């Protein structure tokens, strides 16, 4: 079944859309539940000018899953826009499949950008954590969970700027080792304890997973606990309070925030707002 994971801790028609102003383009990635392609908006928002947009949408399979489709749709439209995250921008819920509307980010995922650049500055890796930490700041005063805070799962638009959002829809996470067959498919490498025992999720579990995330873009792109095998003797690690090594391009500061990010106690890892003000020096 297809399911975005944001949990807040119906429909407003007001974000209707007409499809015959929908001017669909490339595929941009398919998983096997639906698939989100680039297209273009004629008469979308006050402006009524011509932006280029992605939609996401479902294959042929139905119908637990419009479902999932329809209630992804009311958590984006009711958390609000914000300059840091994948903006819900408009749907079309009436006249065929359900469509969602979303912001384009033109240079795709954070991850494949820090790999085919292993030029960037330390300045930029700082304004992509910053950033980043400025959407999940937002997230949180909505009393937001992300639950799959992740490089993948971070796009960079014009300016390169740095929007978080979740993008299950579209790529094989069935297939995907970064994700595990328990059952749930859990990203346990980005998974704080708690999570990964007592499957308690909360704004400072996802401080956890933006401590690995940080990890991810000052080592610009490996995979996190290089070498080491998700098992037994993996969830004894972190249990045990196990972090990974400092990046080779982390200043001795940023790799500061990522071991306040993995305290075993998730009361003394420090807020997105706290993170932020650091970073901002
Ligand atoms: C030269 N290329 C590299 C990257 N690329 C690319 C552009 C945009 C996106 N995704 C999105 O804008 C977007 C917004 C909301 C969602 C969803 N779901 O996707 C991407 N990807 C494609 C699949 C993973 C998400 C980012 C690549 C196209 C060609």
Redesign the pocket.
Known sequence: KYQVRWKIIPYNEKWEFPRNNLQFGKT??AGAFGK?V?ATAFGLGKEDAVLKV?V?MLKSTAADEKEALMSELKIMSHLGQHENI?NLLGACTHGGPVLVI?????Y??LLNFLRRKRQLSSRDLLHFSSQVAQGMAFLASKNCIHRDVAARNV?LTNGHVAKI?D?G???DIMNDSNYIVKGARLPVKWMAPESIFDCVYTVQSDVWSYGILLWEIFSLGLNPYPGILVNSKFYKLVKDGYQMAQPAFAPKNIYSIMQACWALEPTHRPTFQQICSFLQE
């Not at 979303?102 to 033109?106: F, L, P, Q, R």
């Open positions: 941009l990635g989100v680039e992605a996401k994948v979303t912001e384009y980010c033109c795709g995922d796009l959002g993008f829809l579209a790529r």
